[PDB]
Design a binder for this molecule. Structure first.
Ligand SMILES: CCCCCCCCCCCCCCCCCC(=O)OC[C@H](COP(=O)([O-])OCC[N+](C)(C)C)OC(=O)CCCCCCCCCCCCCCCCC
Ligand SMILES: CCCCCCCCCCCCCCCCCC(=O)OC[C@H](COP(=O)(O)OCCN)OC(=O)CCCCCCCCCCCCCCCCC
Ligand SMILES: CCCCCCCCCCCCCCCCCC(=O)OC[C@H](COP(=O)(O)OCCN)OC(=O)CCCCCCCCCCCCCCCCC
Ligand SMILES: CCCCCCCCCCCCCCCCCC(=O)OC[C@H](COP(=O)(O)OCCN)OC(=O)CCCCCCCCCCCCCCCCC
Ligand SMILES: CCCCCCCCCCCCCCCCCC(=O)OC[C@H](COP(=O)(O)OCCN)OC(=O)CCCCCCCCCCCCCCCCC
Ligand SMILES: CCCCCCCCCCCCCCCCCC(=O)OC[C@H](COP(=O)(O)OCCN)OC(=O)CCCCCCCCCCCCCCCCC
Ligand SMILES: CCCCCCCCCCCCCCCCCC(=O)OC[C@H](COP(=O)(O)OCCN)OC(=O)CCCCCCCCCCCCCCCCC
Ligand SMILES: C[C@H](CCC(=O)O)[C@H]1CC[C@H]2[C@@H]3[C@H](O)C[C@@H]4C[C@H](O)CC[C@]4(C)[C@H]3C[C@H](O)[C@]12C
Ligand SMILES: *C(=O)CCCCCCCCCCCCC
Lengths: 127, 166, 67, 86, 81, 62, 171, 122, 459, 165, 12
């Protein structure tokens, strides 16, 4: 067994072409040639700001990013949701229904000032 | 009540925002897995506040905020059940999803469609939260089938592999 | 890379991964020991289990046979 | 999964063969026919291919494996499957 | 780029369980010609590995040391009360 | 070999071995690698049932 | 068709691989791999080809009885966990012809190189077809083997889809 | 445990039927038996919103525990003594159910012992 | 209805008097404007239908069908203009004319007050449909498909004509409002059995009913793409609309006359759904899918409950958009590879990414993913059929499993796996193709927000 | 279950990635020291799954077994459950023994690296959950039943004994 | 070494 002389010669010829093809898949240094790039003045600040390095100004940027997230994705959504619930949902009947609070002996009702009586004396078990 | 109900809903709305932003409105590719992972971690935090309130006093409520459809004597309304099971499971699911997404940022780093992968993971989570908070069986069925189809799409992620499609 | 691959040899390790791994294995065993010191009942037993055969017939209300 | 190179493949292929007791490391070159030069039989060649599969972590089908009769042919076969061109 | 391979002559079956296999093959008049290709798995950082119990007790010395200090601290706080 | 000339309508279509495409050599250079078919060869009557996503007939160890 | 020798060597490789799946531990596998080789060496010289066939059939029956029900499979081999995992990323080169001109302008060097390859393919085609016509018997080809290029400046007939096939890790 | 072997692999006539016990009158052999005291009123358990299966003869300890848990928030390691009183009250309630089973079994034995003795007369 | 009839008629001179190179732009733009005005039909009242005149009216049943009909015309012009690009100008204009005339007959069909006016327009739709199939279909089989289409329809509709005239002689009117007040119960006699069959078989053939459906896989498969869109989206719904109307005058006989047709439908939907699993022609698979879905509409109409009537109305609308989308998706592959065989072109997700998203969305609506209106309609029918007989949930359940299987089998076979090596002409999706798909799916998913407008008069 | 089961998959993903997509445990081995952090998480995860006292899995699995043992229940179902609990220890040992212990059985080019911060921090958070989450959730939820705490010694330690066996 | 990625046209 083993390649016949014909098989070896064809494999060698194909191997040369294949490696030339693979070599031609490499990008040149300038590629990709991107078209005119727009930048924002907000990035201008941060690019110069952080090239310094340090771990005290790599924290301001992190704090800035998280604050912009908290504002756009927590505070504004909760404002919209709170406005929606307070002035549209809860103005209709039975839209938000709370389980009524548990009342325990000795509690005081905030609405009325009523005082709930304590339970009767326990027949103190040994423990 | 006003804080409990506001924060329980924002948890769900917050998770839909990375889906909407993938309408190429604020979209930039490179940061997307980190964006989705950050939304999950915030959703975990907002979900702890209603959970603390339930733990403190056992507060529970039902939100039936949108009337969708009345069929004679069957009124179907988008309604959410913030109770024991949904107050405990939501933070746990979000906490574990938070780790898996951070893990995915490393595991799937060389996948050319990593953004689509994080979109699909997020869509699964949304449908699962719909399932858990559902107050009527129709809304539950939406989440029930939602996770099934997302499961189908994630199992067959490598769609050139015949075994994955099967 | 910061960790270059090796050939037929044990890999290179950062000290960070060894310390962190050691810390969380120690934390596991500290927790187990601390919880067992305080809640050994949760595994062994909360309350003594009575032996029914030792209960007297007077306290279970069993009348004598011939009546 | 770091990338392979032609020299790296050849180095590891020859490295495995120098750990095979039936081969003399001082008479082994890339063009040493396993049967005609090194004087091995076809059962030895099957074991050699199996080692290469273990070395590089992938299978060589029996129809292709049987034709790999020298170290250089093993290198070329691995290089072709891994798209190695340098 | 070139990775440099460890010298191949360092791979020997002596001292490893591959030597036991060789010895009990020589009883039957057989020899194992690939033993040196496996030797690396039994040498260097791979030579010594824990048992199953050793694995489960990872961190137990430091955990137990911290536990003994914790009850002492607990038992000091109680006495100071 | 055609199917038996009952009234079921096979005509002269070849009756080929009832083997799954999963049973074919995966290392051969098929024209349709996923189907493991060559261009021009007769397709099994039930080929769409024997694709690799459906019915498997491979030998089993038990 | 497989010769008798091919059938034996395929069995030997199959038997060893399933043996390795049973043994797992390397030192244990080395031991039993050498016992199995000794069995094959015991009949290496069997001139009677009727008896060598009977030995082969019994060995295959013994293998089927002893095969591991869940043998090890290399990850990318057929049936492996990564088999075909990257086919969804393999895009044929002809798709580049449909790129918009603004997309091609991002890789002026790649596409200039690509035009040379397409020119090479165009100019070789007539000679490749002619070489196959003249080297093929009147009935037609009797095997699937293709010939090499016999001349200088000729390419082996039917090379394009072999040479330009997608990389195994295309993305 | 052992009691299952006796009923299933032995004489089932002198073994209690868990789905039908008690079968003797409560006062058979118990002169002047006291009724069980209930501390928590129906309204208190309704106001506390106890799960119906928790509205047993130990409910008053549970209510005391629930009130402590609410008032000790966020300290979830407090009320550990309140929890134990409820656990111990439930333990004593379980022992009372074990005594009922043992009482039932001994009367079934006594009933049979009378039949055989009252049959050996004939 | 003259505010819709006259503008539709004017599409013809617009088409004929346009510049040669603006026939598609002009007809598409103005047909979309007509579709926009059709939203004025949504002035429906809780009690009374919107009764324009002696000839025409619109209630909550016909209104959604009218809006769908007028929406489909611009989509069909978009779907047709590529494969008619080499047709000579006059024959292009005649093709558009057939589409316009079909729309004219349909919008008058859905608003006709009198059942004999409904009949004439109901048969009238045959003529342009037959011409479209036989003249502009691609294969030899289009001629045979036209004959099956024509004679299956007429075999049923001629007995209907006799029945309707008989009713007018006996009642004195076929005006649908009058029949609501003058309707009398149907006594159980042999003569009334054949009146019932005469009044129903024509509509059953158009659904089609299982057993009487052989015309559909021929006609829907051999027609040009515009022909398939209207055939599946609207023309199948003439049968459902007709049955929903005429059952008014057939009670209580429908109680027992329904049984044979309910069995054909409940078992037929499982049969036709199974057929889809082994179809080799992509267009043929989509056609058999329609038969399975319309079996639910037949069953829903025959059990005559408020829930089944709401479900039937939703399904008819939902199926119309979905089946039309699937035909358009299948056609876009056909225009590239020029074959309808499903296994021919594989792995198209690799070559056409966005088009593979339309395939997924089309498939999900076909298998009735909640909360799509496809699911809402199917669910309401399953609910009502459970009350008709609990055992029906088995047949409904099996069908939903099979439907998921063939819907995703179509998706997996064509979009996934490895692409076919020798098919090298799969050019990128055109803006026209992408707009055509999104004009199906976007309205379909938007209706999920406000489902009541497609739930019919029982809502 | 969500905590330690998710962590186990991530630990296996870490191993799979380090061995170039190898998922067969027969080709692993000798990873106890090569991947110390994945080793720690894998051991914690396995101990949590098998009900090691006071880890996250103990606070549910052990109450479940106690409740089943003391319930009016199908006898065969009870036995199947206990045997399944023992099998849980066996296949948990199977992963640890073949993945981590012994000598390496993977290929010669060693690219083991678990030093990415994304990998460490994601596993680390679930490891903290696999230790304490059961205790924290168990001590904060309101009681909705009457827990059974009185039983013979052998029914109280059944879960632990069969796990040890 | 950066390589070219063959993809279908994304422009349209
Ligand atoms: C014409 C198309 C075929 C249907 C036309 C009506 C039935 C004709 C065929 C049956 C004739 C004999 C009637 C026997 C009889 O007593 O009635 C049926 C008897 C019941 O009839 P019955 O005796 O109770 O009378 C019915 C009530 N009156 C008379 C008031 C109308 O049995 C059945 O219910 C079977 C119904 C037969 C049809 C079954 C489904 C269709 C089969 C034909 C398919 C054709 C293609
Ligand atoms: C079984 C149920 C299954 C349901 C499945 C349905 C699937 C569809 C997809 C689900 C989408 C859910 C959307 C829910 C949030 C939006 C609700 C909404 O659309 O508001 C409508 C509401 C009308 O009130 P309502 O009486 O409830 O409606 C009856 C008619 N359907 O309007 C209002 O009442 C108040 C609106 C004013 C809000 C002002 C806030 C604006 C903030 C700035 C913009 C941001
Ligand atoms: C239901 C109502 C009946 C009708 C609808 C269901 C249709 C069932 C028949 C399926 C029709 C074929 C669809 C195409 C699926 C197919 O052919 O693929 C075969 C697929 C191969 O899968 P696999 O074994 O993993 O092979 C991978 C190779 N490496 O293998 C598969 O994926 C198909 C597996 C389907 C087997 C279904 C078995 C059902 C068992 C139910 C019993 C339990 C009943 C309910 C629960 C018990 C009570 C609690
Ligand atoms: C009430 C409920 C109704 C619902 C149930 C409806 C059932 C379906 C009815 C189907 C009607 C028949 C089938 C129609 C399909 C088209 C027929 C066809 O294409 O057959 C082809 C056949 C071949 O011959 P040919 O086409 O002429 O050769 C090529 C030259 N052109 O062509 C021929 O050989 C000639 C075909 C002649 C038949 C033409 C159709 C006439 C149908 C009405 C039959 C009239 C019966 C009157 C008899 C009264 C006396 C008994
Ligand atoms: C093929 C060629 C043969 C074509 C079929 C031949 C006709 C079949 C006859 C069916 C019997 C219908 C009939 O004759 O009923 C007559 C009945 C007369 O009664 P009348 O005086 O008008 O009113 C008082 C009621 N006695 O009139 C009535 O009362 C009601 C009549 C309503 C109109 C019926 C129209 C004829 C329907 C025949 C086809 C219906 C079945 C369709 C196919 C069934 C499925 C295969
Ligand atoms: C494949 C071809 C496709 C074309 C299909 C064409 C379908 C045409 C069907 C026409 C049949 C109409 C029925 C004519 C028979 C006379 C009806 C009648 O008057 O009988 C009355 C009686 C009612 O019974 P009952 O409900 O007890 O009375 C009220 C008290 N409760 O009668 C009854 O008991 C009611 C039951 C009548 C229905 C019998 C159902 C038979 C079994 C199901 C067959 C399904 C269809 C088979 C088609 C095969 C065709 C080859
Ligand atoms: C790595 C970072 C973690 C290292 C922690 C080191 C170990 C801390 C243990 C503290 C301790 O020893 O006290 C135990 C304490 C319970 O009080 P204890 O002392 O046992 O009562 C007896 C009276 N002397 O226990 C407690 O105070 C409460 C439990 C302490 C451990 C939890 C630490 C917080 C972890 C929160 C993770 C939550 C993740 C899940 C998120 C979803 C929740 C819904
Ligand atoms: C908070 C997080 C920082 C994570 C990190 O640095 O480790 C950063 C990473 C990328 C950010 C997001 C992405 O940049 C996309 C968004 C674009 C807008 O400029 C702000 C909101 C916006 C939605 C982001 C705000 C948020 O702060 C993100 C999520
Ligand atoms: C009396 O009520 C006894 C209830 C059940 C007894 C369980 C004791 C365990 C013995 C079998 C476990 C075997 C697991 C391998």
């Amino acid at each position: 067994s083993g390649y016949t002389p014909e098989e070896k010669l064809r494999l060698q010829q194909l191997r040369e072409l294949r490696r030339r093809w693979l070599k031609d898949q490499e990008l040149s240094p300038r590629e990709p040639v991107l078209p005119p790039q727009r930048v924002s003045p907000v990035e201008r600040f941060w690019n110069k700001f952080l090239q310094d390095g340090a771990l005290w100004k790599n924290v301001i940027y992190k704090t800035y990013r998280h604050s912009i997230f908290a504002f756009t994705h927590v505070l504004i959504p909760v404002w919209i949701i709170h406005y929606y619930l307070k002035y549209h949902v809860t103005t209709k009947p039975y839209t938000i229904v709370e389980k009524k609070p548990r009342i325990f002996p000795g509690d005081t009702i905030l609405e009325t000032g009523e005082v709930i009586p304590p339970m009767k004396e326990f027949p103190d078990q040994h423990h | 009540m006003n804080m409990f109900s506001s924060l329980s809903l924002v948890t769900l709305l917050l998770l839909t925002m990375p889906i909407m932003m993938m309408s190429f409105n604020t979209y930039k590719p490179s940061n997307y897995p980190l964006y989705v992972k950050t939304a999950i971690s915030y959703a975990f935090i907002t979900s702890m506040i209603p959970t603390m309130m339930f733990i403190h006093s056992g507060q529970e409520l039902i939100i039936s905020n949108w009337h969708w459809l009345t069929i004679q004597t069957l009124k179907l309304s988008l309604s959410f059940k913030m109770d024991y099971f949904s107050m405990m499971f939501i933070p746990v699911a979000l906490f574990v999803t938070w780790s898996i997404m951070e893990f995915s940022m490393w595991y799937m780093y060389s996948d050319p469609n990593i953004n689509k992968f994080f979109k699909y993971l997020l869509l699964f989570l949304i449908t699962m939260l719909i399932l858990v908070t559902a107050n009527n069986l129709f809304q539950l069925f939406i989440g029930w089938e939602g996770v099934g189809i997302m499961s189908f799409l994630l199992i067959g992620w490598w769609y050139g592999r015949a075994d994955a499609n099967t | 890379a910061h960790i270059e691959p090796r050939y037929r040899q044990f890999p290179q390790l950062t000290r960070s991964q060894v310390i962190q791994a050691e810390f969380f294995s120690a934390t596991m065993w500290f927790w187990i020991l601390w919880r067992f010191w305080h809640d050994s009942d949760a595994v062994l037993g909360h309350f003594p289990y009575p032996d029914p055969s030792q209960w007297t017939d007077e306290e279970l209300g069993i009348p004598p046979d011939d009546e | 999964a770091p990338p392979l190179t032609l020299e790296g493949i050849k180095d590891r292929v020859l490295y495995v063969l120098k750990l095979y007791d039936k081969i003399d490391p001082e008479k082994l070159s890339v063009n040493s026919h396993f049967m005609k030069d090194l004087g091995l039989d076809s059962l030895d060649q099957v074991e050699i291919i199996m080692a290469m599969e273990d070395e590089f972590g992938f299978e060589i089908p029996d129809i292709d494996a049987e034709k790999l009769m020298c170290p250089q042919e093993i290198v070329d076969y691995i290089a072709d499957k891994k798209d190695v061109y340098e | 780029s070139k990775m440099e391979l460890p010298d191949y002559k360092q791979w020997k079956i002596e001292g490893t369980p591959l030597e036991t296999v060789q010895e009990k093959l020589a009883a039957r008049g057989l020899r194992d010609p690939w033993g040196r290709n496996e030797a690396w798995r039994y040498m260097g950082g791979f030579a010594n590995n824990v048992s199953f119990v050793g694995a489960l007790l990872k961190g137990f010395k430091w955990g137990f040391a911290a536990f003994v200090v914790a009850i002492g601290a607990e038992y000091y706080l109680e006495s100071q009360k | 070999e055609p199917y038996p000339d009952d009234g079921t309508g096979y005509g002269d279509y070849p009756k080929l071995p009832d083997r799954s495409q999963q049973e074919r050599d995966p290392w051969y250079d098929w024209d349709h690698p996923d189907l493991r078919l060559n261009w021009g060869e007769p397709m099994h009557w039930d080929l769409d049932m024997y694709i690799r996503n459906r019915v498997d007939t491979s030998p089993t160890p038990v | 068709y497989l010769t008798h020798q091919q059938k034996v060597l395929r069995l030997y490789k199959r038997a060893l691989r399933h043996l390795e799946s049973w043994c797992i531990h390397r030192d244990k596998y080395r031991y039993f791999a050498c016992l199995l080789r000794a069995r094959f060496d015991e009949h290496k010289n069997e001139k009677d080809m009727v008896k060598a066939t009977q030995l082969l059939r019994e060995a295959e029956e013994e293998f089927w009885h002893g095969q591991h029900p869940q043998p090890y499979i290399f990850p990318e081999s057929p049936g492996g966990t990564s088999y075909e995992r990257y086919e969804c990323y393999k895009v044929p080169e002809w798709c580049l012809d449909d790129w918009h001109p603004s997309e091609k302008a991002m890789y002026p060097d790649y596409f200039a190189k690509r035009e040379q390859w397409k020119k090479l393919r165009r100019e070789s085609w007539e000679r490749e077809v002619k070489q196959l016509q003249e080297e093929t018997p009147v009935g037609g080809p009797r095997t699937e083997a293709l010939p090499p290029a016999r001349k200088q400046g000729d390419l082996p007939p039917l090379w394009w889809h072999i040479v330009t096939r997608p990389r195994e890790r295309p993305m | 445990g052992a009691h299952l072997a006796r009923r299933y692999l032995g004489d089932a006539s002198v073994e209690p039927d868990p789905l039908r016990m008690p079968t003797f009158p409560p006062d058979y052999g118990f002169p002047e038996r006291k009724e069980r005291e209930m501390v928590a009123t129906q309204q208190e358990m309704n106001d506390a919103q106890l799960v119906l299966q928790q509205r047993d003869y130990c409910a008053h300890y549970l209510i005391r525990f629930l009130k402590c848990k609410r008032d000790s928030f966020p300290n979830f390691l407090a009320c550990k003594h309140e929890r134990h009183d409820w656990d111990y009250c439930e333990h004593l309630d379980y022992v009372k159910r074990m005594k009922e089973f043992e009482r039932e079994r001994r009367l079934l034995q006594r009933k049979k012992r009378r039949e055989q003795r009252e049959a050996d007369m004939a | 209805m003259l505010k819709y009839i006259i503008p539709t008629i004017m599409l013809m001179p617009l088409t004929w008097l346009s510049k040669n190179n603006m026939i598609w732009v002009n007809s598409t733009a103005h047909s979309l404007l007509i579709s926009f005005t059709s939203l004025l039909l949504m002035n429906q009242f809780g009690d009374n239908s919107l009764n324009f005149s002696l000839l025409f009216f619109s209630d909550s049943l016909s209104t959604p069908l009218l809006i769908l009909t007028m929406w489909l015309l611009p989509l069909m012009l978009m779907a047709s203009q590529h494969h008619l690009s080499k047709e000579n100008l006059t024959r292009k204009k005649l093709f558009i004319t057939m589409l316009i005339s079909l729309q004219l007959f349909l919008i008058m069909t859905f608003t006709a007050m009198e059942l004999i006016l409904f009949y004439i327009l109901f048969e009238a739709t045959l003529v342009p449909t037959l011409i479209i199939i036989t003249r502009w279909g691609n294969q030899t089989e289009r001629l045979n498909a036209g004959l099956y289409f024509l004679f299956y329809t007429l075999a049923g509709s001629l007995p209907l004509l006799v029945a309707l005239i008989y009713i007018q002689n006996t009642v004195g009117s076929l005006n649908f409002l009058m029949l609501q007040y003058w309707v009398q119960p149907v006594h159980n006699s042999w003569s009334n059995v054949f009146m019932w069959l005469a009044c129903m078989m024509a509509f059953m053939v158009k659904m089609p009913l299982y057993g009487l459906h052989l015309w559909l896989p021929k006609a829907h498969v051999e027609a040009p793409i515009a022909g398939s869109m209207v055939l599946a989206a609207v023309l199948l719904k003439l049968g459902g609309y007709g049955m929903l109307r005429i059952t008014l005058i057939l009670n209580p006989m429908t109680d027992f006359m329904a049984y044979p047709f309910i069995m054909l439908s409940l078992w037929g939907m499982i049969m036709t759904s199974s057929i889809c699993l082994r179809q080799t022609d992509l267009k043929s698979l989509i056609a058999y899918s329609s038969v399975s879905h319309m079996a639910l509409v037949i069953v829903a109409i025959l059990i005559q409950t408020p829930w089944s009537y709401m479900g039937a109305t939703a399904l008819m609308i939902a199926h119309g958009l979905t089946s039309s989308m699937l035909f358009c998706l299948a056609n876009s592959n056909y225009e590239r590879i020029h074959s309808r065989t499903m296994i021919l072109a594989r792995g198209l997700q690799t070559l056409l990414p966005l088009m593979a998203t339309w395939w997924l969305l089309a498939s999900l609506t076909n298998l009735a993913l909640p909360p799509t209106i496809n699911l809402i309609g199917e669910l309401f029918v399953v609910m009502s059929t459970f009350s008709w007989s609990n055992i029906t949930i088995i047949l409904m359940g099996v069908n939903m499993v099979i439907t998921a299987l063939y819907s995703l089998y179509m998706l997996i076979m064509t979009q996934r796996g490895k692409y076919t090596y020798h098919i090298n002409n799969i050019s990128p999706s055109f803006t026209r193709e992408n707009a055509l798909m999104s004009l199906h799916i976007l309205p379909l998913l938007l209706l999920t927000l406000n489902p009541k407008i497609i739930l019919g008069p029982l809502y | 279950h969500a905590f330690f089961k998710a962590m186990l998959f991530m630990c296996s993903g870490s191993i799979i990635h380090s061995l170039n997509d190898e998922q067969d445990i027969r080709k692993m081995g000798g990873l106890f020291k090569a991947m110390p952090f994945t080793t720690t998480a894998l051991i914690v995860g396995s101990l949590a799954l098998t009900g090691m006292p006071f880890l996250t899995g103990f606070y549910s699995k052990d109450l479940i077994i106690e409740a089943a043992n003391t319930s009016y229940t199908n006898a065969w179902a009870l036995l199947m459950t206990l045997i399944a609990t023992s099998f849980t220890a066996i296949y948990s040992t199977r992963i640890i023994f073949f993945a981590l212990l012994g000598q390496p059985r993977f290929p010669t080019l060693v690219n083991i690296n678990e030093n990415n911060p994304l990998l460490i921090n994601s596993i680390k958070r679930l490891l903290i959950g696999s230790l304490f989450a059961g205790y924290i959730i168990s001590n904060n939820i309101p009681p909705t039943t009457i827990p059974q705490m009185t039983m013979p010694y052998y029914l109280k330690t059944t879960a632990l004994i069969v796990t040890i066996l | 070494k950066r390589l070219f990625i063959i993809k279908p046209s994304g422009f349209y």
